[PDB]
From Swiss-Prot, chain A:
Annotated compartments: Carboxysome
Residues in C-repeat repeats: 1-36
PTM comment, free text: Unlike H.neapolitanus and predictions for P.marinus strain MIT 9313, this protein is not thought to have ribosomal frameshifting.
UniProt free text on domains: Has 3 domains; the N-terminal domain has 4 short repeats, the central region has 6 longer repeats. The C-terminal domain has 2 repeats and a highly conserved C-terminal peptide. The C-repeats serve as the encapsulation signal for the alpha-carboxysome, and are able to target foreign proteins to this organelle.
Disordered: region residues: 1-25
Assembly notes: Probably interacts with the carboxysome major shell protein CsoS1 via the N-terminal domain. A CsoS1-CsoS1D-CsoS2 complex can be isolated following expression in E.coli. Interacts via its N-terminal repeats with RuBisCO.
Protein name: Carboxysome assembly protein CsoS2
Family the UniProt entry places it in: Belongs to the CsoS2 family.
Task performed by this protein: Required for alpha-carboxysome (Cb) assembly, mediates interaction between RuBisCO and the Cb shell. The protein is probably highly flexible. The C-terminal repeats act as the encapsulation signal to target proteins to the Cb; they are necessary and sufficient to target both CsoS2 and foreign proteins to the Cb. The N-terminal repeats of this protein bind simultaneously to both subunits of RuBisCO. Probably also interacts with the major shell proteins (CsoS1); that interaction would increase the local concentration of CsoS2 so that it can condense RuBisCO and full carboxysomes can be formed.
Coiled coil regions in record: none
Gene: csoS2
Curated annotation (Swiss-Prot), chains C, D, E, F, G, I, K, L, N:
Keywords: Bacterial microcompartment, Carbon dioxide fixation, Carboxysome, Photosynthesis
Annotated family: Belongs to the bacterial microcompartments protein family. CsoS1 subfamily.
Interval of the full protein contained in this chain: 7 to 93 of 103
GO biological process: carbon fixation; photosynthesis
UniProt comment concerning the protein's domains: The tight homohexamer forms a small pore which is positively charged.
Descriptive protein name: Major carboxysome shell protein CsoS1
Function of the molecule: The major shell protein of the carboxysome, a polyhedral inclusion where RuBisCO (ribulose bisphosphate carboxylase, ccbL-ccbS) is sequestered. Assembles into hexamers which make sheets that form the facets of the polyhedral carboxysome. There are estimated to be 538 CsoS1 hexamers per carboxysome; note this number includes the probable carboxysome shell vertex proteins CsoS4A and CsoS4B.
Entry's localization field: Carboxysome
Domain BMC: 3-87
Source organism, top-level taxon: Bacteria
Length: 43, 90, 87, 87, 87, 87, 87, 90, 87, 90, 87, 87, 90, 87
């Protein structure tokens, strides 16, 4: 019962937020390796 | 011994096997648990480094969203507490 | 052949008839008849990838609409060694 | 772990709460609690690359709303050995 | 770790400077430098997954304007056990 | 198995990642890497025809974007016995 | 393998060219060349299930344009152990 | 010494023997077989080098289009698999 | 006998296609497998003149729709003895 | 023991720290000291030969603008005087 | 007579064509062949001055558009001793 | 002399022009000449960072207008140890 | 031996060997190398006296450009360095 | 060091001003104070390439307006040993 509430994917504590970071801020239309960009995790 | 825990629940054993196969084909993650919650919920438990766990779990979510009834959530913990570990069966 | 052919369904009637489809379709050997819970039953067999493909085919034809119905049909081609302890 | 994560913030309270976020999100050890001056406080943590990255991202996402928020949040994967006396 | 990253470029200067970035940004072991032929030069790094993409960090934005420029920067989360003879 | 699979691509990035896709996708052994020349790199795998067929599909859709793209892909089930010197 | 591919047509000109297609298509072992009567001619070949599939696909795809062409291109993966004594 | 197959289907043995004689009057080939399929279906199978086989079957086709029930098919397999020789009887 | 057929194409995949067509078409032994460089790959077969022609036809239409296709297709009628070192 | 002195000003400790890391990575030059100026000003002081110092300082200035508050000052001293040495730990 | 004729062309198809033309239209001796790289192929023949002239005429004639066409035909009438290590 | 000065071009003409410009303009050591393939040519010098800078300026301003010219002129300020064994 | 270096690079070795013929026909120069750069570039090294090498390179640049695709790159080197000799076959 | 930097000027006052800028601009030792005759005065400094380069640039662009003015300002990096008589 009780409202199965379909809901999909959270990627909680992803560690991909672009901020002060420094070594990050790279994926920006670049690299193009693995899945760090593919099918963005739409938190 | 990988401390980062990746761990995913899904509806049905087929999506669980999808997730586990993606785990073992994605990164340096060691599957540590495959348990049946009940009512069709099956959870997979893998260990590894933070980056490896993240990549593997996201690959599993990608490979699992469409198979069968599909997963309901994907979750990763980075620095798990040692007190939680007995609840996983150590 | 080591590839995994494995099927999920609601209720044990489709699971058993799908296992029969497995064993009469191609060269396979069942290594799992799992009770997932809540009516979910999984049947899983070993064989080469072509044989398991053709077997999963047959399992699917007579299962989606027999009994209570099929949930998912699947093919595994490379069972990872790390997956083996889980099976 | 030689991977070095480190976070600047405007206030001791966000600094220490972000340190707790670092520690609970990832199993890494912190080495520095520095008072820059003018309210700027820096926290220095050590661990492997993935762990420190996940920890710092979690702390940056959980620290902006408390006090004056973040000032900077960056990590170094393989810091130089001669940097060690600086911290 | 054993995670495999690697980068190509059209030339040897961008390739070697990218390898410099690989070994400077993160502490990843450098395992190979190969001439594909006709100017395609690739370089291979191994290490932790976070450390692997951490190496690729500096290379990607260091070899874009060097010589003919970056060709490809895709990386592998894990290679298989029999890929090594082809490496 | 004597079935043959082999694909061609510009640059070794797509080559190795597609070989990885093949070796996670089906029971295929990478029997050859060939720097054909002019940026062409080809991978050769033995295997069962269904397995190597699934593997060549995986390699094909692996690098639609990786590197600068594919060049060719196909399947051979029975090469002639005298093509071994060409293998 | 244990799988049986087998194809029938009016006359054997299509049957023999289809047998050539069998052999050029996949690793398969031709075992039967049967003149049914009145023009039906059937070829019985043994091989792996996917090999059988590729073989029968090629034979059918090469049979329509010759003579009266295909009549029945069947595929079977595992006949029971009491069937091959009649074969 | 030739391995290529040149061979003819005919409804009726008249075009069958006419095709065989066209084979032997066209190019240097030897007929490896004459087979009664059933229901008037008859084949002639000849062996030889590719060019001779092609010329022979050319002449046979040009000769058997109208004779009797008529020609059914002509086909020129040039390199059968080693396992196909038993299919032609050796 | 010594009649030389040979096919040039772009890359190895159509080269393997052409070789397979050589071997499945007529009585020819492939004697040469050259990676010319810059993408050109050549296959060299010997046999009877008509057999060579049939093989060349099969190769020519077997390696053009695959990859970027062939660029050249030739048939030596008789290689002069002086050409033997070239083979 | 290259006497050439590079030294970089940053608002906040972050840009100073990756400034030092870039100093070390660009060239094998030695850092003589980091200082908390006060008011958020943090300064890095490195020593080495003139060309290596120039390259390292250029690299650090490149790497620090985006991260944190960014640069405040950046310049190269080729020949620090003897009278400035007591300011460097007499 | 040691007059040295030589031609260069894209792809070794027209190269071997015109080498056969060399040895097929004049009484010259084939001292060898060479694969320049990137599709460039040359052939080196030796013989009488007028004979080598007619030979290269015929070779360039048969090489002109076949495949990718001829690049440079040439005749030297009196090669020097120092050239022998270079040929 | 850890500073790694580096030049690429198309062909040995600008390559050795750059090389002797290196060794004649400045008192530094040339460590390597390499042929990338496809015409790209590689020269590697070592020396003091200022000396390397002067040398590379000299070569880059001396060799660009000869032959096909310079392609990749770039030097490393603080080269890492890890790349040297791969040199 | 005369250290004076002449080297000529061309597209394809037909102009390269024309240049080599000009070398060995002009002056006291010995071809010390015939190498294939890659992708079709072919280049030749000769060594000898300064004036001899200069005259030879003159002859090559007179008789090389109009041969097929022709000359791409030539020059002279007057007094080559000792450290270049390892790059010259050592 | 082995790097030689050196300048003329018309008048001794600008010469010593330039040498003064030499000796404080960068770590360098000066070796020559030569009176050419007719008013040309030459200053000879010895040091490493970066120091001499920076020092000479500073002294030249500081001495341009000083007195009558400079003469020439270009500097060699790695002088040949043969310049020993210049000592």
């Amino acid at each position: 019962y009780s409202a199965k509430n379909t809901e999909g994917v959270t990627g909680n504590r992803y560690e991909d937020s672009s901020k002060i970071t420094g070594p990050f801020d790279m994926a920006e239309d670049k690299v193009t390796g693995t899945e760090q960009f593919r099918f963005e995790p739409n938190k | 011994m990988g401390i980062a825990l990746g761990m995913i629940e899904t509806r049905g054993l087929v999506p669980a096997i999808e997730a586990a196969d993606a785990m073992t084909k994605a990164a340096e993650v060691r599957l540590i648990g495959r348990e049946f919650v009940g009512g069709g919920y099956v959870t997979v438990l893998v260990r590894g480094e933070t980056g490896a766990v993240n990549a593997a779990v996201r690959a599993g979510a990608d490979a699992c969203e469409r198979v069968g009834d599909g997963l309901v959530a994907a979750h990763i913990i980075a620095r798990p507490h040692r007190e939680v570990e007995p609840a996983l069966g150590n």
